[model samples]
Target: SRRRVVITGMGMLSPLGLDVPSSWEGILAGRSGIAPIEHMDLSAYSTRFGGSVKGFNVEEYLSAKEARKLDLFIQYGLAASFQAVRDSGLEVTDANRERIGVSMGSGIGGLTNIENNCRSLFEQGPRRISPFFVPGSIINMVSGFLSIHLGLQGPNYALTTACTTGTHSIGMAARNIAYGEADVMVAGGSEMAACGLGLGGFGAARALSTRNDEPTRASRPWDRDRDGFVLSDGSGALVLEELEHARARGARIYAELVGFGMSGDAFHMTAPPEDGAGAARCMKNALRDAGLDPRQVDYINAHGTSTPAGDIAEIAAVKSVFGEHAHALSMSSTKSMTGHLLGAAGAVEAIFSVLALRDQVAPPTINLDNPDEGCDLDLVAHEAKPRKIDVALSNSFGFGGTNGTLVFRRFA
Candidate 1:
């Protein structure tokens, strides 16, 4: 028997707001979450703004003592996971505890924590370091700690594919349910790396937008004068469960996770091939896995990171994969509003995809004042567009040419 998987719940915290509803409301209104990087002194850096979660209170979810033991990324992930679990209404009784697991992680795990530890090591001594450094800062701690907190015993781990971490983690979690490895999985990703090191590292590479005077307009994907992506911090989680399992529990299905595709751009370390060959294959693979025709895809929650090369490359990939259908379907980058969430981007965007299907509307790409040469598509710009979105796709491409794609079908 082939087991099918469906999303039962969603949880997220973004720069737009602290939860799904608030963030989504902002997205539909074409709001930009990018703002000045207020937490750090960025006077020397050209790039200053970032999308940090607003008004987050860890005390609402964890005790102060426990919160101090884990990095902020871990705290965000745990809170999002808790929200998803509660939303799903999945009772983790002894009989089903063994079938529940977690798959959440960050692209750059504990960057801020590592930076602080480095500072202590140089100033004080080895003895001055916190005892919980390793466990608190490691990449897998999000899934590991979530598993322990919820008493889950199924497959447990986290991926670290730079920006593709969230997509891969959620994709694998859906596979776990499909292949009977687990019946229910709390899967997604989180990030809180917009600290001094986070900003400086991306800045040094010239990978970030230096829109100091115009932070909100900085992440303009496909715009002719686009500079680079805006860095953001956030978390997104989804509860993926078997079709029958969800039906048995009367869980409100968000969407059906029908396909997963992954690829590597063996050509470069960070830059995709100008023709977008790798990205085309990734989308094609996803369509094949879903047994879907390209024409069936209604909307694409694109990985348009606003970088000049990346934006055009993704447009080329869309043309290559969907061909004639590409002209008919619509796609937009939510990054126009939330900036780029790094590890958390894919999952949150995936959640946005589900919401898009639920509402039969596509979110807009803000700041699309001008289209770059050859960047021609029915791009939803300026405002969200209402449409019949029965099937949607989400894309994620990370550093080292790693790529992932997911297809979501309106639950029938």
Candidate 2:
């Protein structure tokens, strides 16, 4: 028999706040984290604002010497994981250290470091490049550092599936626990790609919102005048443990990770199919895995990235899968407040979904003053809505047409 997996604890650092409680409060209050880009010069770019994390002190989580060796992405990951591990209170004793693992990643790991090093290579020559360049910038370093930091010896993995990185990381980690590969796992994703190249590259693709004059009003998912996604930086993490292991430790269970599903659009490199066939199937697969019917799903943390095509495509997928019960479900895009955290989006939103289950209140999609055609579902617009959510699903779709869905059920 397959073992069951449950979330014991979570942590996050986002534009809206620095920790889980603050972040969730910001979400409930309909606060926007997007603001002027302060990390890099954006005068030459069309978009000048992003959902940048604020007031995070890396020194608080790591020693100065150790912190200097890792890039901002790794630092963020470490910080979030530290919070999660502490929150879970899961003591890693010698008896169980080998049975604990870490599975985390970043969508665009260390873009800031890469850009800085490349600039050094051009202006100051190769000799000036720092020795910590490679280890600091690689995608897997998040997992590596996490394992080292916690002395975990089980499987360590880092996935890089663009925006789906966080969701996939959590799902894979849960599978590892369920399959008896590990008793506990730290899983999530982090990102810090709001640098010059990061912003300009996405801007060049016309993938970023250019509402520079009103950053707070940007990232309007499903809005009639929605422009594009706002670049954001942050990290989110969760402690997943086997049900028996958690109960033995008297760990507080947050939710049960009942199902995970992934799919490929195979249609475009950056754009989803207009018909949303792949996305629809992905949701169907998750429900099937959970042995749930469509009507049983109470909420969805949509992958509504505020892009024109992406927002509408997800709606199409939801309508296709849920059919008549589509309107009954309260779906919202927390990206409206937190901006787009890229690789960390799924992980952070997964936490929000879990919170919605715990609090019996659905967070809102801020800045949804005008809904676009076919986007008229119950978006919990403009304000938080009080509702009981027994089963919630979080959808994450990446640039390569890769898709992942996680079904989280309230632990009884």
Candidate 3:
């Protein structure tokens, strides 16, 4: 049975805030979430700063014993999932438990746990590592632990497509409901890879910013001086229900999931293709999937990571797809405020996109003091702008040149 899908609720454990309301407020106010990393020690690295979910009280979401059983990243997922379920207001009783599912994702889950456990095993011995080390470090455990915690018996799965994982998860979950496999699905992305190894690894690859003295403005996407993305830690989740199910239950709907596009650059492993061909295809294909015309899309939650090549390639792709309409639409990267959450970036940005449709405002791309000539789109630089956004596009690209775009139309 073909059906329609609608987003009922969303929650975020982000660098900007712990919940969607706070995060949205931060976004509307154009607050920057990029800051000095406070999650762990960073004395050994030249690039010592990265973004982290500030002030997350793990014990508030789960018991200390329960939290201890999982790594911080996974815990972030669990917390965000709980918040999403609560937001959705759907009672997962025994009768409909199997019809409700989860399709959450992460890029590199539990990296800190792996590093710590491996370090202990080498320095001291295997016995020093906790018994939960294996369980804590696996990416799939995000769905496993959340399903068990919530007693959900539906289609539980995890996707790990680098930065594009979340977009795929949300889109796939919506597909599940649309295809009649499930009536409702909890879908989104999460990440917590802002540790010494996480930062140093990205920095070594020159994929992160080295603006040690300028933490706030280091993640300057689409600017000529842009160096690289700032590593960030956070989790974001959304609850999607079949439109009829939501209406029957009198649940509030945020927006309708109309289209999702996925593509491979087939060019490079870590870099976007030159001329942004694949990225353009991803967005245009999504519009095709949604049966949407480019003129109807009013805002774009861009995958602008504050990197030089990535920003130019993404902008070029945008112009290529939207053509003359590109300038008419507003586009912004919430990454400027929240940094980059790796796999979780798409879900977090998707949340911003959905809320932008609801509020009719596009969050600005922070830290763009100087816009690069190649990137001329109105990035809503430095300040949130009032605009009408009925249909919005959210784009996400990953390290393997994987690109995904999803389109959402306002429900009201």
Candidate 4:
């Protein structure tokens, strides 16, 4: 028999708003979170804008001492993880802490810290760097600090599968619970790459949209006028528990995680297959894992990065996977509002997918004025759509040809 895992709680610290509710509200209202980059002084840089998280209070999420010890990425992880724990309603007492664990993932762990420490050591001196620098900058510090802060003594680790890190983390966490390795696992992804180097780095790669004049209307997935993705920063977390374990403890199960699939493209370092054939297999595998037919899925939370080839290829992949039911699926990219959260994208997107299933509201794909002809589907465009989502699929593809897809079914 297949072991069943469910999502009891989810959290997010996104550009749309701080928590999941706020973020979902913005998404449903068709509001755009993308705006001119105001967090840093970008006058010297050629590309001066991105989808930056507008209002985030560090003090509100964590203490001064705690916040000071972590770099921006770690802080984002800690904040969202705290929210997930509080929302999960799973008591991690000293007795049960041994069986509980944490698996937080991050793609770009500490770019700011790396750049800062490197410059400090070269210019000022090695002595100038803080003693806690390494601990604060390491990717696994997300789980390390989370375990310490929450008194969680379960397995702890980090995943680094580029953009799919978030989905991979949660899927792996579910596997741990199913395999009897842990009873409860806090899994998700966090990332904050809004620094000058991050923007300039992606800009140089020609992966970032330079619609500086109209930042809010820039990230246009499936639109013929679309340029590139709007680089954004955020974090999201999920609490995954075994079905019997959660039921025994009377935990509130948000939705049942029925299936997960992971695939590798082996095509290119950054670009996916031109036809999205690899992604199509990944989607079908996830559906098969869920023990559901293609027609059972009502929606798809796409990994649409608002890029030219990515949008079309992904849609083609959907057609290949869903076939006749492709038009029946209400697909949308919440990245239209939050931009791409990198490692955190899948986590937050999964949270969004679960919410859409629960509330029966499909978030819209914004900035899609002129939809591309090849990418034809029932995209929830411009405005939110009402749909009864019994089973939903969330697709995430990373830079290194890594793809992860998850299916969620409405819990009875």
Candidate 5:
């Protein structure tokens, strides 16, 4: 077998909380983090609400000067990465530093920064723009900043695949370890897409919920009244290390990274085929990579983003792949609670999948008042359910028809 990878530590900033424990607790408690946009004026936009991270203080994670120069996405990314490193208890030495790396990314990086710079360019001049804007706002800067700050000399890069960015990052990092390119990788994603351009652009694209009166209940995945996904801002990270290296370091392993799979729809820009053929192949590939049977999968952290089309599509895919086992296994969208985290969704949901394996409990899909037609699976709704979960699969599909799936097994 190739070198195995295990999750050593995890950190996150979610609408639910600022750290892993808090976010997991909120998830299991069935609390809603979606709310109306308060920091920015959304009167002109049709979709006026989203799942926004609140009460975050960048100073708690980085210095004022350092935080000021970076975009909010980078700040969120760095904070999650730092928290993950600290949680891993990974002692960086002259010998080991070169073998550790970072692979963090964002779905839409620095939209707010680009918006402001564009305004300045038109009203004032190019000379008025901040020199740090480009470097601070780029997609790969999170990995760059993490490497420079943490002294990691191994693979430092980011994958920019819309909503699938985080899943791809984590999967590719595991590949790096499996291929002996690195001993450890800090991998995940971050996003801050609730700003003016973010909200307005997505608003124009008709991919957001317009349930402004009931923001908390707006992100009702699989429910009949579900309009669209709740735009969210947050970050999540996991420290993936070679299994033997983790054992040698006496690290507490969360879950073994047993499989990673990817596929492309080659169909559309913003929609999946109603058949979910692409998604089915992706999950099948992940199980194949793990040498796993469909019946052995106990839970799925669904990419059920509450969109009318995507929810049904994912359910159809699960049925196609798992057959009758689709009804046997429990699948819940933490997005029902956290809303859609976009670029950060995959990493954040992967953490939830890991947590599900850790506690033998499947998180709930809140606000599922009524399941739509074809959404007939046992979607652990309203509250968490304790179950025998040994294997969990997490899925993510992005705008470009890119799909990724990661399978995690409970450590024996």
Candidate 6:
């Protein structure tokens, strides 16, 4: 017999809003979170806009001493994890504690911390560096801190796949439970690399938008005027439990995680296959895993990062996999509003996809003024549309040509 997995709870901290409810509200309203960077001075950078999390008072989530000891990414991850655990109402008792695990990841973990500490090392010598620097900045530390706080002893792990970190984390966690390694898992990804190197590095690659004059309209995925993706910061978390275990506890099921598939472009470091065949294979694998036909899928949360090459590649992949059904699918890129969260993009978008199934409404791809040539699919452009969606798919393709797809079904 095969074990089934279901999402019992979800939590998110995005530029759109501080928590899940607020973020979902912003997404439904088609509000843009991209704005001029205020976290630090960006006078030297060409791309001065990003979706930085505003008014994030760490005190509200962690103690002052604790918050100070960790990097911003870890703090965001911890807060989202705690929120998810609480929302699930799954208490960590002696009997079930061992069966609960955590898998959280970040693509560029502690970049800000590393950059700052490197500065100290050169200017003030190595002795000036804080002891917590290493612990705070590492990618795996998010899972480490979360496990310690929640007393989760099963399958503590992390992944660092550039943009697919969040989706892969959730997929791996579901597998852990399905494989009988654990009964429940807290899994997701977090990111807070919108600082100096975060912006400068992407800018140097020409992967970021330079619409400094109008930040809100900068992240225009699939739009003809799009320059590049807008960097953003945040975290997303999900509580995955075995179907039987959740039913036993009377946990409310948000959605059933039915399928997960991954692939490698094997063509380029940052660019996908020109025809998107690799991405098409990834989605086909996901639908096959779910045992669903193309016609069954009603919506797709696209990995449209506003990058010229990426947005087109993903659309091509979708068309290849779904065929004629692609025209009927109401697909949208929430990145148009929240900007690209990089490592956290997968998980954040996964939550949005699940919400679409729950609310029976497709979120809009804001700023999609003029659809580019191959981007003629129904993007739910600029306004939320009410629809009855039974199944939804979320796509996350990252740098290094890695790709992942997740299929969620409305729990009957």
lDDT of 4 by residue, 1-412 (tens): 6578999988889988888899999999988888777767887665676656666777977789888868888988888898898898888887899888999999979888887888899999999898888998989999999999888888899999999999999888988888888888999899988886788888889898888898888888898999888888889999998899889988988999998999998899888888899899998888888889999999899999998889998998999898999999899999888899999999999899899889988899998888998877988889999988999899899988999999998999
Judged by whole-model lDDT over C-alpha atoms, candidate 1 comes out at: 0.91
Predictions in order: lDDT: 0.91, 0.93, 0.88, 0.88, 0.93, 0.91
lDDT per residue as tens, model 6, 1-412: 5689999989889998889999999999999988877778999999888998888877877789889879899988988888889889998889998899999999998888898899999999999898999889999988898888778888888999899999999988998998899999999999998888899889899888999999999999899999999999999999999999999999999999999999999999988886798889999988998999989999999999998898899889888888899999899999999999999999899899989999999999999999999898999999999998999999999888999999999998
Steric clashes per prediction: 0, 0, 1, 1, 0, 0
Worst 10 residues of 3 by lDDT: 32-41
Model 1 per-residue lDDT tens digits across residues 1-412: 6589999988899999888889999999999998898878889887889898988998988889889989889998988888889889888989999899899978998988898988999999889788999999998998998888889998899988888988998999999999999999999999988987888888988999998899999999999989989999989999999999999989999999999999999988889899889989999999999999999999999999999889888999999999999988999999999998899999899999999999999999999999889878988989999999999999999999999999999998
lDDT of 5 by residue, 1-412 (tens): 5899999999899999988999999999999888887988888889888888888888987889889889899999998899999999999889998899999989889888888888999999999898998998898999999999889999989999999999999999999999999999999999998888888888888898888899999999899999989999999999999999999989999999999999999989999999999999999999999999999999999999999999999999999999999999999999988988889999999899999999999999999999999888999989999999999999999998999999999999
Candidate 5 residue 395 C-alpha distance from true site, Å: 0.4
* Whole-model alpha-carbon lDDT for candidate 3: 0.88
The C-alpha stretches of model 6 lying farther than 4 A from their native spots are none
User: What TM-score fits each model?
Assistant: 0.99, 0.99, 0.98, 0.98, 0.99, 0.99
**Steric clash pairs (candidate 2):** none
Q: Candidate 3: misplaced stretches above 4 Å? A: none
Q: What TM-score would you give candidate 4 relative to the actual structure? A: 0.98
Worst 10-residue stretch by lDDT in candidate 5?
42-51
For model 6, which pairs clash? Answer: none
Measured with C-alpha atoms, the lDDT of residue 172 in candidate 3 is: 91
* Clashing residue pairs, backbone N/CA/C < 3 A, model 3: 221-306
Give the Å error, residue 172, model 6.
0.9
